[PDB]
């Protein structure tokens, strides 16, 4: 409704609805809340992130939380999170943005050195390698975008 929408519009929004509104919000109001909300609990935030709803919730919530919080806190939260969902989400990622690649950095931090799957990891290798290659290609394309002796002349004129 109009009242709750303009409450979302106005910055300050005190405590309890910020605590648990996401469960209630899980359409148009959901978009408005994610694009503007002063306080967002990382639990529900990463749960919605890892939901495969993917109406560009990925990019939206990623840029949101990256503007909102700290990489260390994120890493702790998604250590507390499970890893199966991590695998599925990164599978979607490698199948097919600086926000999401920063999330890739973060999730590698969270996972550390233990849980990795060989073939999946090699698929990641190829994907990331080709995407690198194209990226530096884009770099030189940018930078390029940013970029006497008449010893004897056998000539003539039209008099």
Query: Which positions touch another protein (CB under 8 A)?
Result: 11-12, 38-39, 63, 66-67, 70-71, 97-99, 101-102, 104-105, 108-109, 112-113, 116, 118, 121-122, 124-125, 128-132, 134-145, 147
Question: How far apart are the C-alpha atoms of 86 and 120, rounded to whole Å?
Answer: 12
Instruction: Tell me which long-range contacts 19-25 makes (C-beta under 8 A, separation of at least 24).
Output: 20/44, 22/48
User: Residue 45 CB, nearest distance to another protein (Å)?
Assistant: 16
Q: Minimum distance between the CB of residue 74 and another protein, rounded to whole angstroms?
A: 11
Can you read off the two tokens belonging to residue 108?
A: 């590698």
Min separation Cβ 72 and another protein, Å: 8
């Amino acid at each position: 409704p109009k009242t709750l929408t303009f409450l979302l519009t106005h910055p300050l929004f005190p405590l309890s609805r910020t605590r648990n509104l996401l469960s209630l919000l899980r359409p148009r109001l959901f978009k408005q809340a994610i694009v503007t909300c002063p306080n967002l609990p990382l639990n529900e935030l990463l749960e919605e992130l890892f939901s495969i709803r993917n109406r560009e919730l990925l990019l939206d919530i990623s840029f949101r939380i990256l503007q909102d919080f700290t990489r260390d806190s994120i890493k702790q939260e998604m250590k507390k999170l499970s890893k199966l969902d991590v695998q599925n989400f990164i599978e979607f990622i490698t199948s097919g943005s600086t926000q999401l690649f920063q999330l890739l950095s973060l999730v590698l931090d969270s996972i550390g050195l233990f849980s990795l799957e060989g073939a999946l990891l090699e698929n990641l290798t190829l994907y990331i390698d080709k995407q690198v290659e194209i990226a530096e290609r884009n770099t030189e394309l940018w930078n390029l975008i940013d970029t006497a002796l008449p010893t004897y002349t056998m000539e003539y004129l039209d008099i």
